[PDB]
Design a binder for this molecule. Structure first.
Ligand SMILES: CCCCCCCCCCCCCCCCCC(=O)OCC(COC(=O)CCCCCCCCCCCCCCCCC)OC(=O)CCCCCCCCCCCCCCCCC
Ligand code: HEA
Ligand SMILES: CCCCC/C=C\C/C=C/C/C=C\C/C=C\CCCC(=O)O[C@H](COC(=O)CCCCCCCCCCCCCCCCC)COP(=O)(O)OCCN
Ligand SMILES: CCCCCC/C=C\CCCCCCCCCC(=O)O[C@H](COC(=O)CCCCCCCCCCCCCCC)COP(=O)(O)OC[C@@H](O)CO
Ligand SMILES: CCCCCCCCCCO[C@@H]1O[C@H](CO)[C@@H](O[C@H]2O[C@@H](CO)[C@@H](O)[C@H](O)[C@@H]2O)[C@H](O)[C@H]1O
Ligand code: CUA
Ligand SMILES: [O-][O-]
Ligand SMILES: [Cu+2]
Ligand SMILES: [Mg+2]
Ligand code: NA
Ligand code: NA
Ligand SMILES: [Zn+2]
Lengths: 43, 73, 514, 98, 259, 105, 227, 79, 144, 46, 58, 49, 84
């Protein structure tokens, strides 16, 4: 396939931000729950 | 210099297919022979040699003496 | 406008988009549940609680991945987008009923989340067998919410099936015979006939479970003359065809990807592929008791269900060989979608081969309700149905959106996922052969090493799933707009540009009879 | 044993249903219900492809019983050829609106 | 402007409202079964009927009044209705499978016999034979209605379609009376379970088919059908023959052979 | 099916047609390369001379590149084909891709 | 029992389990060979720059690819079905033993002559004696005479369970209202372990089976001491 | 009159994995034989074999529930 | 030169080694000297210089075969980035073992395992091939 | 009519890539988070 | 009865750009609003009933 | 002109490879994971009775 | 079969009307006669508390939880026998 160059390029730094934010969005809430499992169980 | 010889120019992909498929078939036979000697017959012979002079009572008495059983001290 | 457009749609592309978004969300839900499973099993002992919470998570993982992720993406998402383009049709036969198929799935998914929130959830297995699933051993609302969730998903799919069958039969150009429609179109029509014939039988069996639970019927209760094994027949009568429903649209997308990235104008042996998919659909209806080899069935019956299950290998093998013969002589393009399809061909074949081992009732005595079965069915679902989905998604993403993915990130994504799913499932064959049962929250110590590796693998697949989200964000964030696509002469769905206008084929294609 | 009181299509059909009914009585196919029959497809004798605009997609089944269909846009102007068999097609644009 | 014969449907709210009505009925039933309450259920049943009414109304607007049902669109409707009937046959098939499974291998709890110890079946020569004559007669009346419509005869169409509906109502009233008079109940083991569930869903289908016939009767009164275009009547007739054939299977399997 | 000699003859005839047009030239080369063979020198010779009749120098050089390509790893075939075409390349003034630096990546 | 890093089946304790081992070795070789041949042909198809993209004739090769798999299937099904019927054969048991599944433990009944019955519960991990196996030991084992044909009858008094002993090749579902039959013959004395193999609620993981196989004289004195 | 009974033999009427009807039929045979005997001025010891067979095959709780139901007047088999 | 989105229904250019003569020229608009070059191409190609011949090729085609078939270093990035995300995953596994997993059961303590191993040997666990078969009951040690 | 073209045939905006990132994060992040929270809701009952 | 189908065909074909479900007039709007209010109303009440059923009553 | 892979290919492969080996070897050996390997050739059996 | 009627010139309204009034309705009128004749109540059987009948695993969601939906006091005993 051929395509145009990006209309709104995403530089290496903008990609590192989108990648971090994306991973944190899956990791932090689940991490919070697994971390506090003991609190939940012997509560 | 010298002219170059006319090489084969036709059926090159078909030819390669034929040679390798027959290669695959001869490897498949070689593997089954390895398999039937390394796994299948090995198993058949480990079982048969185990039970050839197996003495089940003597096996029981060793287990009993080692204290494994509830019904037999 | 926005409500008119997205809540009241009668447009097959927009509805296809709704199903892709819904399935992508369900996929995150199924993935989390699959990580909770592997967290419990990742070391010896108890993490979450006893088998009840654990089996609530296993049941929900299976329902969400099957009913809310695979079926809506393959059939709702890809079927709706591509089927009418591929036959030059202006929309689906019933564009308004097509929208209700979509809109019944968030309610169905709400009822499933509700069942896991009330009481102690439905810890039943996705087969929901009584008596564990009846009103004494699963008292309260969770199981009834589950049976209702299934009734709505079953209605969504029955009406979809009717819509897809009618569209593919009735809305081709008048010159095009059924033997001039592409393979993906055939796979969706065969899938839809299977849904039509099998889901009403499920709906009858779960209804009977609903009435044994709430109206004092005893269809499955021996005290009233009923039989727990009758439920297993009615369920598997649906359950076997349902796994052919989960793979056949996969087979059709695979035929189109392999043909496309081989640079071929057509798949090898077209009528043989039509033959194979119809033979698989047919034999898929006469083999259901191979889920019941240990229930106490007569030996001749066992013998019959062994042999009829094994026959399915023949048509299924013609398809595997025909994919290989399509690659033969191709100008091979190593695109990320072609890697998903190559992975599919090899790893679907390994998992179809352990289905063949499991067809033998004698061996199945020892393999049944062990992880050997779990390994089988993840090779075909996580490395079969899911591989065709990812291959299909990256191939058609530029059609549906008008934007390119970054190919190097998509190759990276492939590689990670490929390592994680093999690490996860391969060692489960050994846990199976050595005797580890299904639906266990903990295992004798001996099973430790393969469970530890299995769970490390499931974390590697996690990383691939998170990366996939970033990769879709990067495409929409950069806005690289599609220009030219190759091989449009044999791939009609690209011929109206990327993305196609809201209305396509307002003027139908011209095809003469000759 | 029998009177009338039931309207006929001729009296009561309306909209596109009526347009199709009335065109069919004239031997016409403005809504593409029928499959066109091919000419010999030479440059002198091209397949004539009606359209209400300046391009239309053609599918060409090059040989009888081919499962593979060859698709391409046909544009107003000089006849074009199927990229697979070379058979000739020519667009004949316009109107439909009576 | 399109130059194909297919129908592009106006964007509509009824798919949403029907899907939400499905949510409201299922969560209503859960509330009724487990939390002693009917409210959500009667809200779902209300929006369900509203949805069906508006949606089929609009189908009538788009066909009779707007003319979008070309022959190609009708043909698609024909397939749709046939496939829908096929799905309903396979739904009943699961209840016949249940019935044969339990009656061909009666368990010890039943006395190991069929009918179970303590079950006194209805006599199949009394009301069930009457029911049979009724539905078969209504198969003959609806065929007369069809032929009269094709021949352009509004009066005899109305007459035969009315006799057909009257028989459908008769069957429903006879069945309601047999339910009340029956000495066994749904809670009387697998005999009452198979009996009331299979005949109960059949009777629900008699009620739906009789409603569909009444809809055809009012649209006939309003001259919507022509002598050649009347698919909703054809669909109601096919569905009515389906409801007839199911009955004949119930009568032979459960009332006669299972007695 | 037919002999190799009759296959070749049908292709030499196709390209030799005096008033072959640009479409036919392209359709003939694009079809030809789908086959499991590198085209005989006599066929390439006739395609090159159709390029000449069509005043299309660049397509002449592309036809030589596609001969190299169709050979795959059989590195002996292309220089043999060029050897055999030399008198035609000389008579027509057709420089090879290598003489034009178009083999450089 | 299973041992750490185990790849395959537990060693066979019964002639039937030994037949399954040989039949699995035969079927696994076929699985490896077909899987390997697929992978290899894929790599073949992908490793050449030679092309051939024109229409390819299919019927010739479709013959090969339908007949050779048919034959492979027959060569699996023949030993498969021999074993099936071998397992179904009449044998004349010397003893009948019942087991009833419960949430969450098994009971056993040996009522050929006296009414002997008892419950068998997992030993909790806090009470294992050193050397004992976690999740696998019971309080009261199912003592049986070795080298003899035993009929096991299996049912349940509550939900579904499944009674399994992998090294004997046994797994029979425990369904309430139903009495399922299997046969068991151990070639050796010793201890043989299994686990509940149908999902059955909160303690599904924790209701194991242990057979104790011993000489008939020991079995009979044990039986009498259990009255 | 044929003993050294060890366990219930193979019965060609019930050759399959499901043995429920074997237990059931032998329970009915024993109780039917006993009823014929108790009445007609004969001796239940002729019923012995059925009693051995059903004791061998039938779960304790089944016999016990079936016995309770004969006592109650609610046993659905014909004796 | 410039390809537009609104051109999708028009024959387009492609560089593909299996489609050597695409449906349109890569460059259709010609300058004055390019026009003169096309007129000169109608006479003997022996009178075209090497630069004129390259220019004619570059008007017709975008990339040569050697350019369109070139290999790339993309594999390095791919395999390196894959291994980076795999190694990232081990950080998740570290976190999990630190913050989520408690102690594993006492049956994995070294003295328990030695005793249990002895007991498995006493009961002859898998005596044919799998476990006890690897113990020498005569020399009281693991077989070599 | 409706907007046609890339970024316009979708129920979400791609006009600003950072708003998009936040919407996608909430969308996929809530799917993935839901079963952890339901586990926690189950544990906290009993 | 008289055949008044021709009047309904004129009403429903009027070029006023209304969708079919509102094209009969103000009464269609009323019926639409009642349906969609019950549906949306009932759906919020089902969510309330889920959240109530999600917690033990002691 | 050199692309991203010409410029950074080698360093991404080298650094990804080294990081991947380091962190998995650390995770596998240094944090108390119980792999439960075979006792065969490893464990000296001890009196249990 | 041919049943034993005749006809077949053609398939018309007049014929299906003939069949509705000359065969179908008279069959209904005759079965109506047959049924409404063997009507009248039969002697309810002695109540036996069979454990496979009058099943109650969960109360019914209406009335007092113990009455079936179309409960008929004359012929439907409760788990404890007939209503008084
Ligand atoms: C993930 C960690 C696994 C750890 C391995 C354990 C160590 C072995 C001890 C080293 C040996 C020590 C001695 C012990 C002998 C015991 C024999 C036995 O009792 O026998 C029973 C065993 C015997 O099995 C094995 O002997 C290991 C499996 C070998 C299969 C070949 C694949 C290579 C596997 C290794 C890497 C996994 C990658 C997945 C490969 C992809 C999926 C198959 O259990 C099975 O039946 C597993 C069932 C697998 C069925 C799937 C077939 C797939 C085949 C693929 C062919 C393509 C070629 C690969 C080409 C592959 C390239 C793509
Ligand atoms: C997409 C999903 C999918 C697919 C396609 C299949 C395909 C098959 N499955 Fe499976 N399977 C499941 C999903 C699927 N399966 C699931 C979810 C379960 C468990 C359900 C539960 O309990 O929850 C299951 C369980 C299941 C069981 C029950 C085991 C038990 O529970 O004890 C059995 C028994 O036969 C079976 C067999 C097969 C076979 C023969 C096929 C065949 O279709 C495979 C055919 C393919 C090939 C054979 C490979 C390609 C062929 C060749 C290259 C030709 C040459 C090959 C030979 C000569 C053999 N599977
Ligand atoms: C009058 C003649 C026709 C009968 C119709 C009358 C009312 C019921 C409606 C029909 C629905 C059909 C079957 C549903 C289940 C059971 C009803 C069976 C028919 C019936 O009405 O059975 C009655 C029991 O009703 C009961 O329990 C009543 C319980 C009512 C609640 C319905 C339960 C939920 C229904 C499940 C719906 C699922 C739908 C499937 C969706 C498919 C998706 C693909 C019989 O009464 P009885 O007192 O026991 O015995 C007579 C003693 N004199
Ligand atoms: C007690 C009740 C509780 C449950 C509620 C169910 C209640 C009853 C509803 C009964 C069904 C009513 C159907 C009315 C349909 C009217 C619309 C119609 O009939 O529309 C026709 C098209 O067919 C069409 O869509 C036909 C589409 C109709 C399909 C309907 C079939 C049954 C659906 C019921 C659902 C079954 C549920 C079963 C449970 C498993 C319009 O085309 P024509 O007739 O050619 O007219 C055009 C001419 O005028 C031109 O000259
Ligand atoms: C199955 C998928 C999950 C895979 C594992 C994910 C890896 C976890 C990502 C980080 O998660 C965070 O971890 C912190 C610890 O690192 C937790 O802080 C807790 O830790 C403390 C530090 O000990 C406190 O400072 C804080 O208050 C806090 O609650 C925090 O809540 C949690 O969001
Ligand atoms: Cu008992 Cu699982
Ligand atoms: O189901 O395989
Ligand atoms: Cu199956
Ligand atoms: Mg099982
Ligand atoms: Na655990
Ligand atoms: Na009609
Ligand atoms: Zn053509």
């Amino acid at each position: 396939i051929t395509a145009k160059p990006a209309k709104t390029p995403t530089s290496p730094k903008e990609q590192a931000i989108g990648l971090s934010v994306t991973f944190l969005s899956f990791l932090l809430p689940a991490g919070w729950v697994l971390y506090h499992l003991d609190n939940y169980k012997k509560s | 210099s010298t002219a170059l010889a006319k090489p084969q120019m036709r059926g090159l992909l078909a030819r390669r297919l034929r040679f390798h498929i027959v290669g695959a078939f001869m490897v498949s036979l070689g593997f089954a022979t390895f398999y039937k000697f390394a796994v299948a017959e090995k198993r058949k012979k480990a079982y048969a040699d185990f039970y050839r002079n197996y003495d089940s009572m003597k096996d029981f008495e060793e287990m009993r003496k080692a204290g494994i059983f509830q019904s037999a001290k | 406008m926005f409500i008119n457009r997205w809540l009241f749609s009668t447009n097959h592309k927009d509805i296809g988009t709704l199903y892709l978004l819904f399935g992508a969300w369900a996929g995150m839900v199924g993935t989390a549940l699959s990580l909770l499973i592997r967290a419990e099993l990742g070391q010896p002992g108890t993490l979450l609680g006893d088998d009840q919470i654990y089996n609530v998570v296993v049941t929900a993982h299976a329902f969400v991945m099957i009913f809310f992720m695979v079926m809506p993406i393959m059939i709702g998402g890809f079927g709706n987008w591509l089927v009418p383009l591929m036959i030059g049709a202006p929309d689906m036969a019933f564009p308004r009923m097509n929208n209700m198929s979509f809109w019944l799935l968030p309610p169905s998914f709400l009822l499933l989340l509700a069942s896991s929130m009330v009481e102690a959830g439905a810890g039943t297995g996705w087969t929901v067998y009584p008596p564990l699933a009846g009103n004494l051993a699963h008292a309260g609302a969770s199981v009834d919410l589950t049976i209702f969730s299934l009734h709505l998903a079953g209605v969504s799919s029955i009406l979809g099936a009717i819509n897809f069958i009618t569209t593919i039969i009735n809305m081709k150009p008048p010159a095009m015979s059924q033997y001039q429609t592409p393979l993906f179109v055939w796979s969706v029509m065969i899938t839809a006939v299977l849904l039509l014939l099998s889901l009403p039988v499920l709906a009858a069996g779960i209804t009977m479970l609903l009435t044994d639970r709430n109206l004092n019927t005893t269809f499955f209760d021996p005290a009233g003359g009923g039989d727990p094994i009758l439920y297993q027949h009615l369920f598997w009568f649906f359950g076997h065809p349902e796994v052919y429903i989960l793979i056949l649209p996969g087979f059709g997308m695979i035929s189109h990807i392999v043909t496309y990235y081989s640079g071929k104008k057509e798949p090898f042996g077209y009528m043989g592929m039509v033959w194979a998919m119809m033979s698989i659909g047919f034999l898929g209806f006469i083999v259901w008791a191979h889920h019941m080899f240990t229930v106490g069935m007569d030996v001749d019956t066992r013998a019959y269900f062994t042999s009829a299950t094994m026959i399915i290998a023949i048509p299924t093998g013609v398809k595997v060989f025909s994919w290989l013969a399509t690659l033969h002589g191709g100008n091979i393009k190593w695109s990320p979608a072609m890697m998903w399809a190559l992975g599919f061909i090899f790893l679907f074949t390994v998992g179809g081969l352990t289905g063949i081992v499991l067809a033998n009732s004698s061996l199945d005595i020892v393999l049944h309700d062990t992880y050997y079965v779990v390994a089988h069915f993840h090779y075909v679902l996580s490395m079969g149905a899911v591989f065709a989905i990812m291959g299909g998604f990256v191939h058609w993403f530029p059609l549906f959106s008008g934007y390119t993915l970054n190919d190097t990130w998509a190759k990276i994504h492939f590689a990670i996922m490929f390592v994680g799913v093999n690490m996860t499932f391969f060692p489960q064959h050994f846990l199976g052969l050595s005797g580890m049962p299904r639906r266990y929250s903990d295992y004798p110590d001996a099973y430790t090493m393969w469970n530890t590796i299995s769970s490390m693998g499931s974390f590697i697949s996690l990383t691939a799933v998170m990366l996939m989200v970033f990769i879709i964000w990067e495409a929409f964030a950069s806005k690289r707009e599609v220009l030219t696509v190759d091989l449009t002469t044999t791939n009609l769905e690209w011929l109206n540009g990327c993305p196609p206008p809201y209305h396509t084929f307002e003027e139908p294609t011209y095809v003469n009879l000759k | 044993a029998s009177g009338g009181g039931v309207p006929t299509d001729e009296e009561q059909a309306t909209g596109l249903e009526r347009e199709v009914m009335l065109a069919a009585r004239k031997g016409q196919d403005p809504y593409n219900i029928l499959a066109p029959k091919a000419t010999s497809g030479t440059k002198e004798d091209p397949n004539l492809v009606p359209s209400i605009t300046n391009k239309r997609i053609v599918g060409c089944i090059c040989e009888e019983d081919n499962s593979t269909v060859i698709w391409f846009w046909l544009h107003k102007g000089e006849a074009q050829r199927c990229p697979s068999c070379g058979t000739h097609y020519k667009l004949v644009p316009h109107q439909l609106a009576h | 402007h399109q130059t194909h014969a297919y129908h592009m449907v106006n964007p509509s709210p009824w798919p949403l409202t029907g899907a939400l009505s499905a949510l409201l009925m299922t969560s209503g039933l859960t509330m009724w079964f487990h939390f002693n309450s009917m409210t959500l259920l009667m809200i779902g049943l209300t929006t369900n009927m509203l949805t069906m009414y508006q949606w089929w109304r609009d189908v009538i607007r788009e066909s009779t009044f707007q003319g979008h049902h070309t022959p190609a669109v009708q043909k698609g409707l024909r397939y749709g209705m046939i496939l829908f009937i096929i799905s309903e046959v396979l739904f009943f098939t699961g209840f016949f499978w249940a019935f044969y499974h339990s009656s061909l291998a009666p368990t010890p709890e039943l006395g190991g016999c069929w009918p179970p110890t303590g079950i006194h079946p209805l006599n199949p020569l009394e009301v069930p034979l009457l029911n049979t004559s009724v539905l078969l007669a209504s198969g003959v009346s609806i065929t007369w209605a069809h032929h009269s419509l094709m021949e352009g005869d509004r009066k005899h169409m109305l007459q035969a379609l009315f006799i057909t509906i009257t028989l459908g109502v008769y069957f429903t009233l006879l069945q309601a009376s047999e339910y009340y008079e029956a000495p066994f109940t749904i809670s009387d083991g697998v005999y009452g379970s198979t009996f009331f569930v299979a005949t109960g869903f059949h009777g629900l289908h008699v009620i739906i088919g009789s409603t569909f016939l009444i809809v055809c009767f009012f649209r006939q009164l309003k001259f919507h059908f022509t002598s050649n275009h009347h698919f909703g009547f054809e669909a109601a007739a096919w569905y009515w023959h389906f409801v007839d054939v199911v009955w004949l299977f119930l009568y032979v399997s459960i009332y006669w052979w299972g007695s | 099916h037919e002999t190799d000699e009759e296959f070749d003859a049908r292709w030499v005839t196709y390209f030799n047609k005096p008033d072959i047009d640009a479409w036919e030239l392209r359709k003939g080369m694009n079809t030809l390369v789908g086959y499991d063979l590198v085209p005989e020198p006599k066929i390439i010779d006739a395609a090159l001379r159709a390029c000449r009749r069509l005043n299309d120098f660049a397509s002449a050089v592309r036809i030589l590149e596609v001969v190299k390509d169709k050979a795959g790893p059989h590195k002996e075939i292309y220089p043999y084909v060029i050897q055999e075409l030399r008198p035609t390349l000389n008579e027509l003034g057709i420089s090879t891709p290598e003489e034009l630096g178009l083999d450089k990546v | 029992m299973a041992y750490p890093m185990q790849l395959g089946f537990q060693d066979a304790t019964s002639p039937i389990m030994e037949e399954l081992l040989h039949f699995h070795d035969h079927t696994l070789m076929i699985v490896f060979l077909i899987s390997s041949l697929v992978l290899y042909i894929i790599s073949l198809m992908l490793t050449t720059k030679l092309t051939h993209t024109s229409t390819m004739d299919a019927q010739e090769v479709e013959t090969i690819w339908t007949i050779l798999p048919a034959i492979i299937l027959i060569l699996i099904a023949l030993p498969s079905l021999r074993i099936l019927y071998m397992m179904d054969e009449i044998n004349n048991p010397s003893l009948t033993v019942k087991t009833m599944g419960h949430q969450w433990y098994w009971s056993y009944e040996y009522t050929d002559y006296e009414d002997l019955s008892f419950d068998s519960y997992m030993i909790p991990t806090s009470e294992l004696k050193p050397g004992e196996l976690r999740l696998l030991e019971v309080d009261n084992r199912v003592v049986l005479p070795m080298e003899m044909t035993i009929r096991m009858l299996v049912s349940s008094e509550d939900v579904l369970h499944s009674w399994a002993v992998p090294s004997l090749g046994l797994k029979t579902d425990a369904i309430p209202g139903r009495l399922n039959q299997t046969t068991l013959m151990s070639s050796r004395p010793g201890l043989y372990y299994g686990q509940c193999s149908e999902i059955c609620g909160s303690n599904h993981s924790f209701m194991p089976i242990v057979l104790e196989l011993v000489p008939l004289k020991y079995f009979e004195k044990w039986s009498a001491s259990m009255l | 009159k044929i003993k050294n009974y060890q366990t219930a033999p193979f019965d060609s009427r019930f050759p399959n994995q499901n043995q429920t009807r074997n237990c059931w039929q032998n329970y009915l045979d024993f109780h039917r034989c006993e009823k014929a005997m108790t009445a007609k001025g004969g001796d239940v010891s002729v019923c012995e074999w059925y009693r051995r067979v059903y004791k061998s095959l039938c779960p304790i709780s089944w016999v016990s529930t079936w016995d309770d139901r004969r006592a109650e007047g609610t046993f659905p088999g014909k004796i | 030169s410039v390809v537009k989105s609104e051109d999708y229904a028009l024959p387009s250019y492609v560089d593909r080694r299996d489609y050597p003569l695409p449906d349109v020229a890569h460059v259709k608009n010609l300058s004055a000297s390019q026009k003169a070059l096309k007129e000169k191409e109608k006479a003997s190609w022996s009178s075209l210089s090497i630069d004129e011949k390259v220019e004619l090729y570059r008007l017709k085609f975008k990339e040569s075969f050697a350019e369109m078939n070139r290999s790339t270093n993309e594999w390095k990035t791919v395999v390196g980035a894959a291994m980076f995300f795999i190694g990232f995953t081990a950080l998740l596994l570290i976190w999990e073992k630190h913050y989520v997993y408690g102690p594993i059961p006492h049956t994995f303590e070294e003295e328990w395992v030695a005793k249990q191993t002895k007991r498995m040997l006493d009961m002859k666990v898998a005596p044919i091939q799998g476990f006890s078969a690897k113990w020498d009951y005569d020399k009281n040690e693991w077989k070599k | 009519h409706y907007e046609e073209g890339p970024g316009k045939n979708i129920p979400f905006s791609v006009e600003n890539k950072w708003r998009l990132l936040a919407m996608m994060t909430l969308f996929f992040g809530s799917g993935f988070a839901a079963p952890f929270f339901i586990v926690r809701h189950q544990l906290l009952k009993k | 009865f008289e055949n008044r189908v021709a009047e309904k065909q004129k009403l429903f074909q009027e070029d006023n750009g209304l969708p079919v479900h509102l094209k009969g007039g103000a009464t269609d709007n009323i019926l639409y609003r009642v349906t969609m209010t019950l549906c949306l109303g009932g759906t919020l009440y089902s969510l309330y009933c889920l959240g109530w059923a999600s917690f033990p009553h002691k | 002109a050199p692309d991203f892979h010409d410029k950074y290919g080698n360093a991404v492969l080298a650094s990804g490879a080294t990081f991947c080996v380091a962190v998995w070897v650390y995770m596998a050996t240094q944090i108390g994971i119980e792999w439960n390997p075979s006792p065969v050739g490893r464990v000296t059996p001890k009196e249990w009775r | 079969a041919s049943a034993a009627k005749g006809d077949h010139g053609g398939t018309g309204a007049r014929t299906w009307r003939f069949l509705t009034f000359g065969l179908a309705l008279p069959s209904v009128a005759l079965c109506t006669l047959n049924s409404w004749l063997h009507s009248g109540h039969r002697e309810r059987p002695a109540f036996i508390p069979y454990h496979h009948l009058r099943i109650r695993t969960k109360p019914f969601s209406w009335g007092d939880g113990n009455h079936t939906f179309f409960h008929n006091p004359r012929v439907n005993p409760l788990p404890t026998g007939y209503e008084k």
